[PDB]
């Protein structure tokens, strides 16, 4: 246990989380928005941030606030 550690509407924050060969990749983008309802019909790509050799079998997730 405890085998790894790392440290470092008006806005939309976007992510992608994916696991390949035990490496876990996070992409991101932040933007202003003007549409009140939900995800705006437009286009803007996400850059990579993080790429971790965690080696775990991820099958579920949850969100914190």
């Amino acid at each position: 246990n405890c085998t790894f550690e790392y440290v470092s509407f008006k806005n939309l924050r976007e992510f992608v989380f994916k696991n390949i060969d035990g490496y876990f990749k996070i992409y991101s983008k932040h933007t202003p928005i003007n549409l009140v309802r939900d995800l705006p019909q437009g286009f803007s790509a996400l850059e990579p941030l993080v790429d971790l050799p965690i080696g775990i079998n991820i099958t579920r997730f949850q969100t914190l606030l």
Partner: peptide
């Protein structure tokens, strides 16, 4: 020595049920 033991690419799991050397 008995400390060494065994059972996707670069996957890991230490949960256990396990074999070992001598």
């Amino acid at each position: 020595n008995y400390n060494y033991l065994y059972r996707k690419p670069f996957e890991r799991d230490i949960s256990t049920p396990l074999q070992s050397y001598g």
